[PDB]
């Protein structure tokens, strides 16, 4: 495996180079807002983001070493989490606002109009504030996003396998090494390093929480046939079922 032979700096370079681009929404500022159109925008956007995410995942060290079925499972478990941490990252320099796209910047009040959206909007905003206060670095963010990809599905995958989990766990340990390396490089003391590490990983619990709530709302969208889910989103949603 090439993933386990990477130095910390090469891990970071790999992840950074593989970053997906920031996409635009089809938001038409002239069009009167409606719950239907707003959910349509986010859905269309998420659908195009998914394509880039899938191809980004291939460039995360270790992911290709996995079998195809496991790759599928990890992305089925992690995709909303990964969209959400990306959103929160983009939104760091916009206090009180969520930057879904450069042309789609939403505040708290635009949350509402869509039912149940407010609560999750506040959760995403709180996460963004947390990252801002921690002064999360781009290098740390790409490590976190790779951790989510590898970790979220790892416990819900019999034998002539398992060593697959072992390999994922080894890669995960490498990413922890990389995070610590970044922090020591920024001059943090040992105590500060393990504290910041904990702080970042605990935030992942909240991101899981938000994905779970979102996945609940996604189903409510489906069986309320108004805002059309894409064929890729529909299959992802079936996986959470």
């Amino acid at each position: 495996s090439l993933a386990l032979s990477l130095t910390a700096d090469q891990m970071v370079s790999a992840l950074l180079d593989a970053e997906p681009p920031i996409l635009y929404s089809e938001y038409d500022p002239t069009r009167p807002f409606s719950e239907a159109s707003m959910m349509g925008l986010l859905t269309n956007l998420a659908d195009r983001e998914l394509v880039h995410m899938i191809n980004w995942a291939k460039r995360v060290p270790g992911f290709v070493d996995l079998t195809l079925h496991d790759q599928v499972h990890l992305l089925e478990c992690a995709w909303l989490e990964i969209l959400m941490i990306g959103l929160v990252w983009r939104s760091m320099e916009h206090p009180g606002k969520l930057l879904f796209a450069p042309n789609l910047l939403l505040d708290r009040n635009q949350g509402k109009c869509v039912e149940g959206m407010v609560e999750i909007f506040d959760m995403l905003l709180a996460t963004s504030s947390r990252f801002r206060m921690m002064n999360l670095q781009g290098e740390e963010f790409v490590c976190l996003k790779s951790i989510i990809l590898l970790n979220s599905g790892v416990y819900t995958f019999t034998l002539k396998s398992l060593e697959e989990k072992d390999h994922i766990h080894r890669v995960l340990d490498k990413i922890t090494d990389t995070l610590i390396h970044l922090m020591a490089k920024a001059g943090l003391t040992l105590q500060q390093q393990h504290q910041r590490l904990a702080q970042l990983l605990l935030i992942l619990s909240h991101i899981r929480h938000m994905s779970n709530k979102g996945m609940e709302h996604l189903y409510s969208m489906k069986c309320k046939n108004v805002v059309p889910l894409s064929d890729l989103l529909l299959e992802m949603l079936d996986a959470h079922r």
Binding site: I54, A57, K58, L68, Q71, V72, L232, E235, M236
Partner: peptide, 10 residues
């Protein structure tokens, strides 16, 4: 052959 399955192969 899921959609995800296919895009991961290409």
């Amino acid at each position: 052959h899921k959609i995800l399955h296919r895009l991961l192969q290409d």
